[PDB]
């Protein structure tokens, strides 16, 4: 009863593409309910991503979303772009404002083009640029009132964070799932950095876990492996039957932990 | 609930750093290969400075890993070999060249009880004997079983360390069994890592040990995917010795099979590192 | 053992908040030297803290504003902090507001708390607009968790404190409350109504429980039994009520932080060491 | 909301605990005239409150046992409540242990806490069987949630407990903990070791954390990490350690009594105000 998403971003090295392909595979026999990959202006720009998005499609069938943002476009190149995304069968859109226009904008703009199946981005610990939590929970249900059909969470690594917004998210009458977002860690100087430019908590017995492995990735993969696999146990005991995987581009790690949700080729 | 009782538990296992001893046991490898492997671990585990280490039965490995490392290394020995003369000459040698701890078993005439009682008659040795949560394959019942060790250690065992478990609940059930037969030795969970299930489930069946459905699920499907076995093992025992440490166990005896890599894991989330 | 479990999570959490916590301090304008000698000790005490702002109180219908003034100067020189005058619009018209306020940004006070202040016309709203059009203030209001007394209704309260917001007011502070749920039940009826300012609870660290009660009538806010209970039998033992006070305040804040909370208001009556105690819990330390 | 809806409950069970804890307090003999007078201050005052019994500590290898019993007596004439001394077996004969008993049997002494005392031969165990064989002594033993530190086991430790209670001990007060779910599981260890007395909870409420730190150190009781932090930078405010303490004190308190202790005994170090306020919180008031 546990649906899975993979999240992937569009690789930038001959060595990354490889890894990339292979994954794709190994994930793909888990017949995930979607993949999604991501977007840089600056790091691939939006034909990169198009390109992985088609390349997933044409190689597994499967139902992928691009992350379209709205940042430096306007609003009549984000019709067209929409426009031949559908035409080309690509009918899921991760709307995103960026790295003008809020993501709400481009959610009526999409659902304007047509009956996309858009979801938008929700923040647990708050969006950094907020002017409040109450603003921030106020725009999510503002995206979700334009036609988004779910939220998926930045990672978190205190579970009770996701857990609080979570009721929050249905006190405020907002009635879509709340898909967390799981960052699997195998590389902690990395999500340490992704953690304090979001502003998303790292529990000191996390940081302590990780201390003294700076040049040991065997027993941080175990380690953050363990620390995965113990999250997705207590969100699934709470309730939540969708899970959405920030795999940056690996396979090993996710694919283990949907292995422990019972998710099995 | 479920959240913040995770919560607490890891942040306890997070305060248990530096108090939490730890043993390695070890088996005489077979082929050349084996040998490497085995000597790496040894260079790799030793950084963790177990309280002691071990070897399955032998004397010549004892040697070379106390002369590598200078790590107490007690030898396995048992009496389905030879002759309780040959054992006085045989023990009588160990404690004659620094080996002081000894690992007592009856082996796969006299039993494990008459053992210690003999090495005590021959040294004041550290005597360490075998405990059986889920009951010994040839004991009459789970109470003679209890009484046996008892007797093994009234005669001298001043450790008992366990058969591996799966089942925690079976663990700390026998734990406290023992205490209200007035067994005054730790009862040290022998912990074994499982990376091939095949293996496992093969070992268990020989022992006794039962296999809970929840973790013959946990493997099933992964005959030919050594990657996720490893990491859904390595989670299997993070999560046990996390349980155990928090009901106040504080030692742990690892069933390496001659490999590193896990039990060096295991060890980080307790604390214990280099 | 859930409850013990409950606690040593609570408490790590709480630890772990350390450098993320605002928090604001409200003052009353000393009556006599004795008082004079305590606030400005307490001032320097808690400006240790590093307060987002502080704040004094002015009474409406008192004819005592010079006073509030006096005391808000005194602060900003003596500790560079930003310091809020109270100003009430009950017992004055808005020409003479308008005077005050212009006074007030022309003396570098740009933040002020807005309020109507009880009968002996305006209501808050219009003060809010009034100083609006005078200049950007930073402007903070008055919020209910268990309603005003003279509101009609719930509604009409929670729709009084969006007229605020709406009007201009960027922050919104409540009455103080000894009753944690009905904060968080308001917090979620305040998104509900589209609010979209942080709802920052006003905390009352109680170590004389007659003066407490005496205010918690008044203003229509409820005393739990178990907190009555607590009180009980020590009218005349200072220091039990202070350790017991300390101890609902600190276990407040704690349950606060948990669900998201990172702004206080104490109300310290012009005494620094329960609150500074208490925001030494929060992580919040010189 | 979760924490908030469990700590109302918490907070109103104990309320309705009045009437039902146990109290006991544990003073040492005075060093200085200055500590002679606070102590009898506190004597006064924690008398107030009715406790089952107190306690006063020998220390062992002293040497100065006298001023244990010479206060006791003063105690006793002055208050009339039980006195017990502690009295330790580590550095005395049998013979002069039985001389002692004797004479504290016939000083109207029936209450003795029974310990062995550290090293500068026999157990505390021996002690509680040679006390019986003089007299029929209330007994009580030391526990350690935490293990002795010169335990071979934490199992040895655990047959070592119910080696006292078989030899006469009808009480077992524990070493003081700040982990509470130590305590929790050790109470269930020992009724699956078949020990069938009450094991009453020594509490240490903590106003030097410095002092309170050299002393677990020295007993291998941990300190969480959250409570490190929560003494981290007070080390000259005495103020904010005495509330910081209380509440960590409080809330240990109440969560025991929830789990359904009913009997604590402070360990007061001669100080009455911070035990005092843990009492009244237990509903253990004058
Ligand atoms: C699951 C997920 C996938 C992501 N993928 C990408 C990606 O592929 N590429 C990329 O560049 N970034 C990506 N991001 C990040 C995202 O782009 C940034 O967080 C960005 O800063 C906000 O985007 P958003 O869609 O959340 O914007 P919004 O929802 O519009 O919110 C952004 C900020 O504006 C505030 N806000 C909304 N409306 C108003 C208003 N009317 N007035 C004032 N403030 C307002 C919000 O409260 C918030 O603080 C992703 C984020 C998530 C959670
Ligand atoms: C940590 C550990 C390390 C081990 N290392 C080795 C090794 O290096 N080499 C090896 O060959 N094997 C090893 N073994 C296995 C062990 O040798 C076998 O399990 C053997 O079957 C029993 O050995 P024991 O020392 O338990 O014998 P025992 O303690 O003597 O007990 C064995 C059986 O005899 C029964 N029993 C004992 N005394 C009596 C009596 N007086 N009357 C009736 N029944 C009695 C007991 O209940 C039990 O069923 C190890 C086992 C463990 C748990
Ligand atoms: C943090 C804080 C600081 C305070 N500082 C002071 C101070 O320094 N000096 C002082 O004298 N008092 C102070 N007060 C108290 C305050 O002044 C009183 O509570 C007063 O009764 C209402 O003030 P208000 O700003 O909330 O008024 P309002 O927001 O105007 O509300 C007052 C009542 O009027 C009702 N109401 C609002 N608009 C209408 C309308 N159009 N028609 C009919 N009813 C309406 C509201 O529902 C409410 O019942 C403070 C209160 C708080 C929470
Ligand atoms: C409530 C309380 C009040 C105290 N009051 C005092 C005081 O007034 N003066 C003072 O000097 N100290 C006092 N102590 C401390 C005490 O004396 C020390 O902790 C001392 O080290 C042990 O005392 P015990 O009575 O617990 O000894 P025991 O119960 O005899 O235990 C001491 C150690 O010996 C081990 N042991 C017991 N029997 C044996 C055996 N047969 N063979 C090998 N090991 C054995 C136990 O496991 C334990 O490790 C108190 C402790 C507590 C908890
Ligand atoms: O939403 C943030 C997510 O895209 C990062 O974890 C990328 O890895």
């Not at 304090?196 to 040049?215: E, H, S």
Request: glycine residues 4%; charged residues 25%; aromatic residues 8%.
């Amino acid at each position: 009863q546990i649906n899975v998403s993979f999240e992937f971003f569009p690789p930038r090295t001959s060595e990354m593409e490889q890894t990339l392909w292979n994954s794709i595979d190994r994930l793909s026999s888990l017949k995930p309910k979607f993949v999604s990959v991501t977007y840089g202006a600056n790091s691939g720009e939006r034909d990169r991503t198009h390109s992985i998005i088609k390349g997933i499609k044409d190689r597994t069938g499967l139902e992928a979303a691009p992350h379209l943002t709205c940042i430096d476009a306007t609003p009549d190149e984000l019709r067209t772009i929409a426009r031949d995304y559908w035409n080309n069968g690509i009918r899921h859109i991760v709307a995103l404002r960026g790295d003008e226009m809020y993501a709400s904008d481009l959610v009526t703009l999409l659902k304007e083009v047509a009956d996309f199946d858009i979801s938008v981005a929700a923040y647990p610990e708050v969006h950094p640029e907020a002017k409040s939590a109450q603003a921030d929970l106020l725009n999510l249900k503002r995206k979700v009132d334009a036609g988004a059909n779910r939220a998926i969470t930045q990672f978190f690594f205190d579970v009770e964070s996701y857990l609080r917004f979570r009721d929050r998210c249905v006190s405020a009458g907002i009635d879509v799932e709340i898909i967390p977002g799981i960052l699997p860690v195998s590389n902690f100087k990395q999500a340490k950095k992704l953690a304090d430019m979001t502003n998303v908590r790292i529990p000191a017995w996390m940081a302590q876990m990780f201390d003294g492995l700076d040049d040991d990735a065997e027993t941080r993969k175990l380690v953050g492996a363990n620390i995965a696999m113990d999250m997705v146990k207590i969100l699934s005991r709470e309730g939540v039957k969708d899970f959405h995987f920030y795999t940056l581009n690996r396979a090993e790690m996710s694919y283990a932990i949907c292995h422990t949700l019972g998710v099995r080729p």
